[PDB]
Design a protein around this ligand. Structure first.
Ligand SMILES: CC(C)CCC[C@@H](C)CCC[C@@H](C)CCC[C@@H](C)CCOC[C@@H](CO[C@H]1O[C@H](CO)[C@@H](O)[C@H](O)[C@H]1O[C@H]1O[C@H](CO[C@@H]2O[C@H](CO)[C@H](O)[C@H](O)[C@H]2O)[C@@H](O)[C@H](O)[C@@H]1O)OCC[C@H](C)CCC[C@H](C)CCC[C@H](C)CCCC(C)C
Ligand SMILES: CC(C)CCC[C@@H](C)CCC[C@@H](C)CCC[C@@H](C)CCOC[C@@H](CO[C@H]1O[C@H](CO)[C@@H](O)[C@H](O)[C@H]1O[C@H]1O[C@H](CO[C@@H]2O[C@H](CO)[C@H](O)[C@H](O)[C@H]2O)[C@@H](O)[C@H](O)[C@@H]1O)OCC[C@H](C)CCC[C@H](C)CCC[C@H](C)CCCC(C)C
Ligand SMILES: CC(C)CCC[C@@H](C)CCC[C@@H](C)CCC[C@@H](C)CCOC[C@@H](CO[C@H]1O[C@H](CO)[C@@H](O)[C@H](O)[C@H]1O[C@H]1O[C@H](CO[C@@H]2O[C@H](CO)[C@H](O)[C@H](O)[C@H]2O)[C@@H](O)[C@H](O)[C@@H]1O)OCC[C@H](C)CCC[C@H](C)CCC[C@H](C)CCCC(C)C
Ligand SMILES: CC(/C=C/C=C(C)/C=C/C=C(C)/C=C/[C@H](CCC(C)(C)O)C(C)(C)O)=C\C=C\C=C(C)\C=C\C=C(C)\C=C\C=C(C)\C=C\[C@H](CCC(C)(C)O)C(C)(C)O
Ligand SMILES: CC(/C=C/C=C(C)/C=C/C=C(C)/C=C/[C@H](CCC(C)(C)O)C(C)(C)O)=C\C=C\C=C(C)\C=C\C=C(C)\C=C\C=C(C)\C=C\[C@H](CCC(C)(C)O)C(C)(C)O
Ligand SMILES: CC(/C=C/C=C(C)/C=C/C=C(C)/C=C/[C@H](CCC(C)(C)O)C(C)(C)O)=C\C=C\C=C(C)\C=C\C=C(C)\C=C\C=C(C)\C=C\[C@H](CCC(C)(C)O)C(C)(C)O
Ligand SMILES: *C/C=C(C)/C=C/C=C(C)/C=C/C1=C(C)CCCC1(C)C
Ligand SMILES: *C/C=C(C)/C=C/C=C(C)/C=C/C1=C(C)CCCC1(C)C
Ligand SMILES: *C/C=C(C)/C=C/C=C(C)/C=C/C1=C(C)CCCC1(C)C
Lengths: 242, 242, 242
């Protein structure tokens, strides 16, 4: 179980990376060609934010595709791992923007949003330190650490944002809850795949692992986007409470 | 004079790093458990900002603790130094937020704040380049360079912010001046400890040096926090001038 | 054709780097000494933004000057290249601020500006990945990629910003168009010099190349600055449309 070695360099996962790259690209331009003539100031804002997501994911995927986005991490026993660090560079900007989109739709104050980006980014960096960790003690401490943060993100997402989004139209609250649910479950798959992936225990090959992340990423990016830029809630209405 | 070699890897300073890590953690949660039910929108904002500080310091300390946050820098004479670079990753986000807190309490315009973060970050990066410098000529040029910037930060802090904070309540001006004084002296210790530390001349071992930074950092983070989140000035009142 | 080997380390381009460093410094302080007593809140804002540009360029130039800002990139054939990566660290903050200045003068909404920084930064990073690429296939893919983004930047600059700047005074529109033209042509020289520089085909030595970038950078930084901080358009007037 691996895929295809598309660059004659012993990395059959490049098949999933390539497809991943291709999919983020068409999304970036689907969204761009889709909002190109949108005059609504609220929506064009959602479009801009959402277009950059697959946009930056595309660079990370292309990077990993070529091999530039991956690095060899020697463990404490001399055992080498191929860590695709670029994912974190990706996530450092993508996840915050995704949150941003949820925060705009919910009409939350700048403090909540700031808390959101800060805790989320703390999560990504610490997740990256875990990835480059040489000792298992450290690799797992960072995991729980990054996870505590994610726990905080989900919390404020499932309370502050949700209740704030309930003060708006049913059309709006509807769309918010059907991205927050998507977020909740889709995002959660990430830490699991990591601790069971090659960065953790390792009962899942890098191939399947690279396949999972592609599916998870595309769906969290493009799938989220399609749904979001397709709703009517983004068309007008500027609330304020919570 | 060193401390304790807590990880059997020849780094007795890990004793100070560990304690440093532990102290930033309890602070992060002290503040979190302390503002958890704060409805005041002004204060919850100060809380959020201030909670992230020990929060990010904790990741840097844990990083250095494990050894991941330190790197060997070969000098021009083949002489190796153990540079704890992670401190700068820390400071790149912590010092700006600390400034932010002072800027909110003072009610300064967005231009002043922008100038503040920009010059301060310039200071940290240049300080980091100095740390990784191989030649002493370069290591000291960067020091003065980073110091010129810090000089600008202290300046606008002791004039623009101070006078702007004097237009507010005595309770507010009081708290502002008792953090700005703390800032002024505590922050200043940093460049001194550096030029006299292992990154500069070196009349102070990495142990004592790592001890000093821990004391300085905890007091600048948690000490600042305690004092700030404990004042009444953060509870309400939204001015505007200067 | 090279210049002068100012540090006895086989890098005659340090002559252009040094001059580049020196020129960014006097600019940083020319601007600082020039706006030191400016009370106009609009202009002081332009000044602050514009002062940081040569300011950060100075750190990058000094970095490259010492050699710290350059790294050896082994190509797929074992052929080594001296990549001055620091330029991108430079550009990651400088180009966005330059755009910022154009966006303020034009009075564009926060969405346009956000789109601007995001696409521009995507351009710089991807340009940096191209620089560190080992294969030519990859080095050129990244070039087109970074170029597509730049294409988007020029687009929204020559339409959204321009038309938005035409709603203001003739004095304002005048200055906007005489920086946007400068931007348009000066910025465009960059990708060309790259693909023809040592990072691409290579029909231009690193000396001339390092000379060109210095001329291009100084003129885009200090030249832009002089012109901008010298206009009357920055003195007052706060519009709003587009
Ligand atoms: C788009 C723009 C903005 C910029 C683009 C973004 C990029 C900056 C993204 C970069 C991502 C990279 C991190 C990806 C990874 C790249 C790889 C290639 C480098 C991996 O190394 C990273 C590491 C550096 O140090 C080690 O690795 C280098 C390189 O391979 C080695 O040359 C070096 O020697 C290594 O380290 C030392 O440690 C090892 C291990 O130590 C022990 O060794 C003993 C045996 O001797 C035993 O094995 C023991 O178990 C080991 O622990 C030593 O062997 C060696 O001799 C050296 O001592 O650095 C990792 C990253 C670093 C920790 C950065 C911390 C980041 C901080 C926490 C970020 C804080 C940010 C907040 C979260 C922001 C929140 C803001 C809110 C809004 C408030
Ligand atoms: C949380 C998210 C956002 C991301 C997380 C944050 C991270 C990005 C933080 C990363 C921090 C790291 C910098 C920490 C350090 C990590 C270590 C492990 C790497 C240290 O190396 C850094 C260096 C790279 O180059 C050298 O090191 C590598 C790695 O060990 C080597 O493989 C490489 O060969 C080295 O360099 C070359 O130079 C040496 C020395 O040159 C001369 O050599 C001769 C003898 O031959 C003689 O010794 C002479 O004296 C030497 O000078 C050569 O020997 C070698 O062959 C190579 O030529 O890079 C340092 C950092 C770089 C300068 C970045 C500049 C940053 C810029 C200035 C930032 C601008 C940002 C503004 C300040 C922002 C302001 C914004 C405002 C709001 C406006
Ligand atoms: C001021 C504050 C904020 C912080 C300061 C800013 C700094 C973070 C700036 C840092 C800039 C640095 C990138 C500058 C460069 C520094 C140099 C010294 C490092 C260069 O390496 C970078 C590379 C790491 O990986 C490789 O290099 C290291 C170091 O020399 C090696 O030890 C490592 O082994 C290397 O990689 C592996 O790959 C090679 C090549 O692969 C194949 O190999 C085969 C033969 O085996 C054949 O040659 C094939 O052709 C090759 O392809 C292997 O040989 C090797 O064994 C390893 O497998 O990493 C590059 C950077 C990385 C891709 C980061 C991606 C950044 C992402 C895309 C950013 C997204 C950000 C968005 C654009 C933000 C938009 C925001 C909007 C607002 C929305
Ligand atoms: C072009 C590109 C990539 C190209 C890649 C190539 C060619 C790869 C080739 C690979 C090969 C050949 C491989 C061969 C292998 C063998 C190799 C071998 C072994 C032989 O070596 C083999 C055979 C498969 O096995 C990327 C572009 C990438 C482009 C990107 C990422 C663009 C981003 C745009 C944004 C982000 C816009 C944003 C627009 C916005 C925000 C617009 C906003 C407007 C709103 C208006 C306002 C508010 C701003 O004023 C709106 C109206 C909504 O548009
Ligand atoms: C950082 C972190 C959490 C951060 C949280 C943050 C930032 C939260 C922010 C919240 C905000 C902003 C809230 C805003 C709200 C406002 C509301 C709003 C406005 C937003 O709507 C409101 C109402 C105010 O709340 C956790 C780290 C968590 C870190 C953890 C859990 C670390 C664990 C380490 C271990 C377990 C080490 C173990 C070390 C060992 C075992 C060492 C052993 C050594 C020997 C090792 C050897 C040699 C055997 O290998 C030894 C024995 C010591 O020598
Ligand atoms: C970057 C820097 C300073 C930056 C400052 C900034 C950004 C300030 C911003 C201010 C703002 C925004 C203000 C806003 C205000 C608005 C008010 C408000 C709104 C905010 O309320 C207002 C009113 C408008 O002002 C300094 C660098 C400073 C850099 C320095 C000092 C560098 C020194 C280098 C040396 C000394 C090299 C030496 C090189 C040598 C000796 C080389 C020798 C060679 C031989 C070497 C060998 C071989 C012997 O080893 C040689 C001889 C040349 O070959
Ligand atoms: C487009 C990418 C998305 C939505 C990525 C989401 C990623 C996460 C929620 C990652 C969480 C992680 C932990 C909780 C622990 C350690 C490692 C991570 C970074 C995989
Ligand atoms: C929580 C951390 C704080 C408050 C750190 C403050 C650090 C400084 C004011 C550091 C200043 C430095 C110079 C002026 C010169 C060179 C090196 C530095 C980075 C240590
Ligand atoms: C002060 C520095 C300025 C104004 C730099 C501008 C740089 C560009 C417009 C660079 C563009 C590039 C491409 C379009 C392709 C690949 C590489 C770059 C980064 C050189």
């Amino acid at each position: 179980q691996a895929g295809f070695d598309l660059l004659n360099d012993g990395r059959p996962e490049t098949l999933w990376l390539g497809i991943g790259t291709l999919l983020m690209l068409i999304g970036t331009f689907y969204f761009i060609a889709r909002g190109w003539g949108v005059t609504d100031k609220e929506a064009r804002e959602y479009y801009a934010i959402t277009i950059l997501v697959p946009g930056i994911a595309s660079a990370a995927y292309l990077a990993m595709f070529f091999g530039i986005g991956v690095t060899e991490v020697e463990l404490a026993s001399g055992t080498v791992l191929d860590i695709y660090y670029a994912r974190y560079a990706d996530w450092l900007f993508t996840t915050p923007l995704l949150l941003l989109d949820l925060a705009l739709l919910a009409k939350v104050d700048r403090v909540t949003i700031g808390t959101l980006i800060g805790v989320d980014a703390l999560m990504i960096v610490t997740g990256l330190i875990g990835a480059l960790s040489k000792t298992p003690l450290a690799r797992y401490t960072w995991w729980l650490f990054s996870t505590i943060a994610f726990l905080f993100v989900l919390y404020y997402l499932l309370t502050s944002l949700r209740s704030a989004a309930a003060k708006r139209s049913e059309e709006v609250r509807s769309t918010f809850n059907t991205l927050t649910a998507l977020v909740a479950v889709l995002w959660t798959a990430y830490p699991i795949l990591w601790i069971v992936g090659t960065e953790g225990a390792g009962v899942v090959g890098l191939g399947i692992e690279t396949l999972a992340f592609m599916v998870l990423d595309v769906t969290a990016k493009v799938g989220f986007g399609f749904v979001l830029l397709r709703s009517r809630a983004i068309l007008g209405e500027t609330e304020a409470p919570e």
